[PDB]
Design an enzyme around this catalytic site. Structure first.
Site, PDB file in Angstrom:
ATOM      1  N   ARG A   1     -16.666 -33.086  -4.332  1.00  0.00           N
ATOM      2  CA  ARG A   1     -16.060 -31.760  -4.414  1.00  0.00           C
ATOM      3  C   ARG A   1     -14.808 -31.655  -3.597  1.00  0.00           C
ATOM      4  NH1 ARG A   1     -17.656 -25.816  -2.224  1.00  0.00           N
ATOM      5  NH2 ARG A   1     -18.200 -27.025  -0.382  1.00  0.00           N
TER       6      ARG A   1
ATOM      7  N   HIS B   1     -27.324 -30.305   6.259  1.00  0.00           N
ATOM      8  CA  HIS B   1     -27.864 -29.263   7.126  1.00  0.00           C
ATOM      9  C   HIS B   1     -26.679 -28.675   7.867  1.00  0.00           C
ATOM     10  CE1 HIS B   1     -30.354 -27.020   9.892  1.00  0.00           C
ATOM     11  NE2 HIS B   1     -31.533 -27.564   9.443  1.00  0.00           N
TER      12      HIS B   1
ATOM     13  N   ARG C   1     -25.134 -22.499  -2.799  1.00  0.00           N
ATOM     14  CA  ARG C   1     -25.898 -21.796  -1.794  1.00  0.00           C
ATOM     15  C   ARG C   1     -25.837 -20.279  -1.765  1.00  0.00           C
ATOM     16  NH1 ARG C   1     -26.387 -23.874   3.232  1.00  0.00           N
ATOM     17  NH2 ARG C   1     -26.438 -21.770   4.179  1.00  0.00           N
TER      18      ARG C   1
ATOM     19  N   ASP D   1     -20.268 -17.612  -0.966  1.00  0.00           N
ATOM     20  CA  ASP D   1     -18.855 -17.524  -1.174  1.00  0.00           C
ATOM     21  C   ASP D   1     -18.422 -16.229  -1.808  1.00  0.00           C
ATOM     22  OD1 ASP D   1     -17.049 -19.620  -0.329  1.00  0.00           O
ATOM     23  OD2 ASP D   1     -18.435 -21.063  -1.475  1.00  0.00           O
TER      24      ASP D   1
ATOM     25  N   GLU E   1     -15.130 -18.590  -7.150  1.00  0.00           N
ATOM     26  CA  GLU E   1     -15.526 -18.046  -5.851  1.00  0.00           C
ATOM     27  C   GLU E   1     -15.296 -16.555  -5.744  1.00  0.00           C
ATOM     28  OE1 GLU E   1     -15.749 -20.694  -2.638  1.00  0.00           O
ATOM     29  OE2 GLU E   1     -14.299 -22.190  -3.478  1.00  0.00           O
TER      30      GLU E   1
ATOM     31  N   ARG F   1     -14.857 -20.141   6.188  1.00  0.00           N
ATOM     32  CA  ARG F   1     -15.767 -20.593   5.143  1.00  0.00           C
ATOM     33  C   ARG F   1     -17.102 -19.840   5.200  1.00  0.00           C
ATOM     34  NH1 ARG F   1     -14.574 -26.322   2.886  1.00  0.00           N
ATOM     35  NH2 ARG F   1     -15.583 -25.056   1.274  1.00  0.00           N
TER      36      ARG F   1
END
Ligand SMILES: N[C@@H](CC(=O)O)C(=O)O
Ligand SMILES: N[C@@H](CC(=O)O)C(=O)O
Lengths: 920, 920, 75
Positions: free
Chosen positions: A432, A167, A617, A579, A542, A745
């Site tokens: 990762r 979360h 995401r 991203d 990305e 980020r």
């Protein structure tokens, strides 16, 4: 005595409700608020309740007219609170918001499905109209000419892998979900038709009590939780709903099968459903996630799982009282007995022995966690899932042989499915890490060996060398290798993967992947750290430029004999919508990723590799609910091909899995949509559409980049108008940058702008795109509108942005400017708000909508009912930021009303996040 | 494909049903039977199903017309079965019967209460019309002029003690009740209005599966279960419904209190409800119940209880996440922490320490059971309930002090009530032994000491001596006392009471009590075996002559200073309806016991002793359901006075406690009726009524005795027409005689005649009584009728007998005569059947009824729906008895139909018992 | 409550009305009364009959429990 009717009428003034006997959301909110206000009065005094009421009314009037003076009226009440009073009020509005969300869950859980429906793809965008598993079967037989046997076959070979992630603003504590659960259950049951007066008096009391228990489970915690603790909290939904939901959904699949004429059941060990996890595994830009953390979460997974099996097997043992077995089980039972139940109860003798193995598996894991050493030997424990399945398979067979299949197909079958779906841990862990970190390790090695600097080598050299070493006859380095701390950390992570069993893990994801050497570097590291069973290596592309080269990258990898042999016909590639959108804007990323996936599938086909796209995401498949169903159906053709791997975003997990019906429907829709897609791809775009999307993407990217990267005062503006600096410093999770926006980020980028209700990252660039399409040629409006009506990808893309605008309020962003941003930067803010409105307008015209969410009134109502509460948190947050940042700003404080500013800020940040849920 | 409608229509032909949307019993039976027949076909073949169907139709036709040829038709099908086929069919009819009973439970659970009602005492005889706890409160305030505070007060000081006893024909296994439970729950849920199609497809499947699981949990067991095993099975209802039911009912009491204006709750430690047990404690005429058995069941009780608290406290711990406490709890928490949770969660630190004590309490108990020795010291365990309550009281206080009473009043309060109601064991154990056995011990002692023979002494001497020794300065005997085996067994039992803690026990009941020395003998034995805390001694008066002298006996005891001082103002006396009825007939016993209780209360009042009447088996308070409510209200005035102690008959326990609603209503009605009675005694009889009852009792006793004790061929007849010899020899429980009918025990006496559907022990003597009242003076009919309309005792007495006749069928008894009884004894059987009819006729005229149970159509329907099934078991039983008893009786066997005679007999005995439940 | 002052409070409001106002109010209360009676008729018309009943003469005193013509025949 009775204020329930005034609360209800003021809510209904805000929402023009509906007659439907299922639409009770407003009643639910009225009831919950009434009980809550009573509690506030009991705990904190009439005056404090009155103040909360005062603030709510002001927010209500604002959501009515949108007069910005109301925000300043609310401001002047909020800024005049001593910090103890401020905490209680921020907590009240936070709790009212959570309550509103619980009400929503109950409303969605029991809303009637619609019987008559068009059977076109828009039906798949809402829970009420979407296809269930039987409807999807029937559609495939009838409209796509599949034999049931073919549908059955596709389904047996299908996997859906839901990957759980952290979360972003801290996971709700396990005990708080149970409370939530009880509030929902009391709410559902107060409206049951099946029960009497006194039962209700008692439910009223139960509900009141549970709203209070929840409110007073509220300890105040600046100092974060350990990643181990955050993983435990993330795993709560297994106990809550997933553990039972899986067998329950598999049983529904069985019924759907009987009803289309297939008499078999999905084998218990068909892996239709799997869960993976990132929690304790993702260390990309996060050094709190150490080797030790990883070792731990794999032990905790093992412990939790075996604790669940241990406790469940006791129930199963009660049920399995039967005495008739086949001879194979008889023999086994008598053996075990010869080495504490009667032998006349053979299933219990077998299951009892499984129970002790499970208890052992669980103690061994706890010991190793607490001490590193266990007196419990590996021989007395389960280390592979098949050791655990075997004796259960024996029970199943024995029951069927004796004529009692019908019994086997109850609780035993549920259990075989649980064991097979969850396996020995409940989740397999992905690792990762970013590719630079691998390069550094490799450069440390080459320099040590005195053969040069891997960093300095070209890509052709890197590959040549990595392949020469992957078939090398001779180890590369030892323990005496001189290492920076960071390099030691990467190596120690691989050593953890070597030590731990391979059923703990799934993918090694390489962040910022761009070349074949990125993937080959990890293959070598794994081999050289002696990972007997290497994790599959998955590149995450990305940037837009990285997505453009991705196909060639994968072509090269596949054409290398060592890697091809190694990969055994399977490759996973990951995409990250948020991203990629941070680099080029959302629109341009959406299109690139559609194309990227087409191109990568093409290359896989050519090399005869099965390709799995892992959705990270920010995609439309992350929305949850109905929208997830259409989102899956809208993937490019052949891009699922029997394997869906998808991220369950932490900010969506409660809605998706917290309530048992919703959990069941979530699993259902993932299975339904995956199966359908593999047999019924969406329409491929018309050439004119492609061409227009390419033209629109160029323009969209130019707008976004010129604002976000080339405007010299942008970062300055961003740091003033947004709480991103304070999200970073009060770190809620990871840590914000790795520099400028390149360096920041994805999650912090989204979160900064969601907190101000402005959501720049989701919509910026769409306005330039649409404006330019339409000025270039007025006919483009019609084509844009047609794309919306008939191309699922495009529908789904616009719908997500439309939803984000429904959560938007530029009035709030204007208040932040006024309070936090220096006057010189005000015209800049105002032009960004002019861009919001213009973008929104075009979006409405393309969708054929007069207002936001005209196509989705249920969602419209849900969002509108949250806004009163979120708005108060926003105003509170803005002025609190002013106080923290400016010591010379003061106002007269009220005398204390009830009976740290940073604490208030944490509270408002979490609330606004609980309210905004998913955006981009 | 669809036989559900034919089954339903053939049932409705047998019962003229009703329109009520709640009356679904016949639908429930149809559905359950249909699924069952399908299962039979799947497991055993169409032919076997067909045979079961054939037998059912014959039974159906018999319950229609009552043509006795149908019983012989059924006979000839049943006698023609190989013993393997016979077992399967007896098992089928047994299972259909159980199913019928489950259906009944669901029907009763959800039948609507009636809103408009007369508020007279007949309303209290049915679940639908009886008073709940709020109605009883309101009645007491309104119609009896009590202040709510007074009602509250009475209630705080009230106890209801339900005493669990052995199932007479073996308790259902724990796993079989859970299955039953699931069948009921699926049945309830198939008719819920709240759910959809597929849910039902799944419930259908679940129900089918559960009917099958139940059928195949059927191991065949001639060799009985140990008394320890029978105690475990008896204790099942705690896990099933009682454990939750108690707190749930106490919460209802709280609501009733708010609703009559009292704002407090019943204190958590008011002992409104207690459970006791006889299982492993009653050894009267049962030498399988040894000292060791007693030691064991007390350990098992302790183990089970602490296992429940241990498991429940884990849930409570999850809930108690809160961080605010008072300083008293803060201090304690920090101490415990200093000696595995954070200290920021203080309730969890306290409860965790309670959890370990509970785990310890539980392991110590298991060790002592398995080995006699535990390494776990008593210091680390709970030995008194207050040690366990204290830390929970601390949590409660701490929560209230911090403003969170509302939270305290949830789960914590439930737990305090559970702990306080169940205490450290779940039940306290009574010991029961017959007074002769005490005399023998005492005679062994006097002879050893060479001072004579206690047996030879008169009553005045026995008392003089027992009092001289109870204040003796000098122990009576040692270990070197020469003992028979029986005398050693009595002494070793007392040594167990000395060793074990006093919270394990309740009463020492003296069977066959008649004199004060009976009670004083046990007091002395207890003192001389060094029972630090002697059990209270309770005399059980059995014979009519014994009930006549009981009052003088109690007057003498009370007037002895030592005993008076010792008893501390409390005495319990036990009555046994079935026992007394075996001596004088049911009618005469009913009257004597009304009078006995009036007389004993009078004597207690005079001496200022509080008197508790313990109701043993066979009374109208043992019926369960509504009838238990009126039965309590009908006790003589002042005979409850705040303390109800009552036997829960094993053959009634499922109906009373198996389903959660029924369990709740059972607890409710015991509390309601007890409270009301103490403030609202029934009408005392008119003198004319007393006089008539005395005249009727003389005559009733003479009829019963002349048949049962003075007819020289009675025992012979009884042994042929009844399966009492085979109940004895295949011992189901205890063992049948201690000689003739004097010697036979109550339970076997009732059971023998219930099995033949004749029920002689319940009705014999009533016919002579009524006949003679009416011939003496025709006006007596009117008085008898008036007694029925206005005297609760009399209503209730007749209603029980009326119910027993509804379960009766003299056609069945006639078949037994024909098959089993020699022709010379046939006119004797026929005169007994003439007496049945004549008795029944008079009973109907006195009640103002044309048919049996006209006042209670719900009960009429329930009984009528069972009869088809029971009747087949009866015919099967009769012919099986013929085969066992007569080797030279043979019939042609059918070729085997599906795919030991003693086994069949066990099965039919249990079935008929499951079908007949409670009678006398 | 049956506090008798309330009757005099009502009195003082009623006695202070010109005769045209007095007529309109007496007519209002007259009409509200009739309305009340109409509501009663509807309530009695649709009240459910009680299925379970003693079958003694007291049942015959109320619409909800009295015997209909079939019940009387059967009796
Ligand atoms: N999960 C919802 C949004 C929300 O509930 O806020 C959606 O994506 O439409
Ligand atoms: N327990 C019921 C009888 C029965 O269910 O057989 C009663 O006493 O009326």
């Amino acid at each position: 005595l009775e204020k329930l009717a005034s609360i209800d009428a003021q809510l209904r003034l805000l929402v023009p409700g509906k007659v439907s006997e299922d639409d009770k959301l407003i009643e639910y909110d009225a009831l919950l608020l009434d009980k809550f206000l009573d509690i506030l009065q009991d705990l904190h005094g009439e005056d404090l309740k009155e103040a909360v009421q005062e603030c709510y009314e002001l927010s209500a009037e604002y959501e009515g007219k949108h007069d910005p003076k109301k925000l300043e009226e609310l401001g002047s009440v909020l800024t005049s609170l001593d910090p103890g009073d401020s905490i209680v009020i921020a907590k009240a509005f936070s709790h009212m918001l959570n309550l509103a969300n619980l009400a929503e869950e109950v409303q969605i859980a029991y809303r009637r499905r619609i019987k008559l429906k068009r059977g076109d793809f828009a039906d798949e965008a809402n829970a009420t109209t979407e296809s269930d598993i039987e409807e999807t079967f029937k559609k495939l037989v009838l409209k796509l000419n599949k034999s049931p046997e073919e549908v059955f076959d596709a389904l047996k070979n299908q996997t859906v892998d839901l990957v759980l992630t952290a979360h972003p603003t801290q996971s709700v504590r396990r005990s708080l979900l149970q409370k939530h659960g009880r509030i929902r259950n009391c709410l559902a049951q107060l409206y049951a038709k099946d029960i009497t007066p006194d039962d209700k008096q008692e439910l009223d009391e139960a509900l009141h009590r549970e709203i209070q228990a929840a409110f007073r489970t509220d300890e105040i915690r600046r100092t974060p939780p350990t990643p181990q603790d955050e993983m435990r909290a993330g795993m709560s939904y297994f106990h809550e709903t997933i553990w039972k939901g899986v067998p329950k959904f598999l049983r529904r699949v069985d019924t759907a099968l009987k009803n289309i004429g297939i008499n078999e059941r999905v084998p218990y060990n068909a892996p239709l459903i799997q869960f993976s996890s990132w929690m304790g595994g993702d260390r990309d830009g996060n050094p709190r996630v150490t080797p030790e953390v990883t070792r731990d979460v794999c032990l905790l997974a093992r412990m939790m799982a075996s604790n669940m099996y241990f406790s469940q097997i006791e129930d199963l043992m009660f049920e399995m009282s039967m005495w008739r077995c086949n001879s194979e089980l008889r023999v086994r039972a008598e053996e075990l007995y010869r080495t504490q139940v009667p032998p006349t109860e053979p299933y219990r003798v077998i299951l009892g022995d499984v129970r002790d193995k499970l208890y052992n598996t669980r103690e061994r894991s706890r010991h190793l966690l607490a001490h590193g050493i266990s007196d419990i030997p590996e021989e007395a424990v389960y280390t592979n899932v098949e050791q655990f399945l075997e004796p259960l398979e024996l029970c199943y067979r024995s029951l069927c042989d004796c004529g009692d299949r019908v019994i086997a197909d109850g609780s035993l079958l549920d259990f075989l499915r649980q064991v097979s779906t969850f396996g020995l841990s409940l989740v397999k862990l992905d690792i990762r890490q970013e590719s630079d970190r691998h390069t550094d390790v490799l450069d440390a090695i080459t320099q040590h060996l005195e053969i040069g600097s891997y960093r300095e080598w070209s890509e052709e050299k890197r590959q040549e060398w990595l392949l020469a070493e992957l078939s090398g006859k001779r180890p590369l380095f030892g323990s005496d290798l001189p290492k920076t701390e960071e390099v030691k950390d990467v190596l120690d992570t691989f050593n953890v993967l070597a030590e731990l069993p391979s059923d703990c893990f799934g993918a090694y994801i390489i962040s910022m992947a761009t070349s074949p050497s990125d993937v080959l570097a990890v293959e070598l590291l794994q081999r050289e750290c002696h990972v007997k069973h290497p994790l599959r290596v998955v590149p995450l592309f990305e940037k837009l430029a990285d997505l453009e080269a991705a196909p060639a990258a994968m072509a090269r990898l596949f054409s290398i004999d060592w890697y091809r042999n190694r990969i055994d016909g399977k490759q996973e590639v990951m995409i990250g919508y948020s991203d990629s959108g941070k680099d080029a804007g959302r629109f341009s990323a959406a299109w690139q990723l559609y194309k990227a996936q087409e191109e990568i599938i093409k290359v896989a086909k050519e090399f005869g590799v099965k390709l799995v796209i892992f959705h990270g995401r920010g995609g439309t498949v992350g929305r949850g609910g109905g929208p997830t169903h259409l989102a899956i159906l809208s993937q490019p053709p052949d891009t699922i091909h029997g394997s869906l791997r998808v991220t369950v975003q932490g900010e969506v997990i409660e809605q998706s899995f917290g309530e048992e019906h919703l959990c069941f429907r979530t699993l259902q829709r993932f299975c339904a949509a995956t199966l359908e897609h593999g047999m019924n791809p969406p329409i491929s775009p018309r050439p004119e559409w492609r061409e227009l999307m390419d033209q629109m993407a160029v323009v969209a990217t130019e707008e976004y980049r010129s604002i976000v990267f080339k405007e010299p005062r942008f970062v300055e503006y961003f740091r003033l108008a947004t709480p991103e600096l304070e999200y970073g410093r009060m770190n809620i999770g990871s840590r914000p940058s790795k520099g400028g926006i390149e360096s920041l980020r994805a999650i912090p980028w989204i979160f900064a702008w969601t907190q101000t209700r402005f959501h720049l990252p989701v919509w910026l660039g769409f306005g330039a795109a649409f404006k330019h399409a339409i000025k270039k040629d007025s006919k483009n409006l019609q084509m844009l509108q047609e794309m919306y009506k008939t191309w699922p990808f495009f529908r789904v893309t616009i719908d997500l942005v439309e939803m984000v605008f429904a959560k938007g309020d530029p009035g709030i962003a204007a208040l932040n400017d006024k309070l936090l941003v220096s006057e010189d930067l005000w015209p800049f803010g105002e032009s960004l708000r002019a861009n919001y409105e213009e973008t929104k307008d075009y979006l409405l015209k393309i969708a054929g909508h007069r207002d936001l969410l005209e196509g989705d009134p249920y969602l419209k109502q849900r969002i509108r009912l949250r806004d009163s509460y979120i708005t108060t948190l926003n105003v509170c947050q803005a002025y609190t930021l002013k106080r923290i940042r400016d010591p010379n700003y003061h106002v007269t404080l009220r005398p204390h009303i009830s009976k740290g500013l940073e604490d208030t800020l944490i509270l408002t940040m979490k609330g606004i996040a609980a309210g905004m849920q998913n955006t981009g």
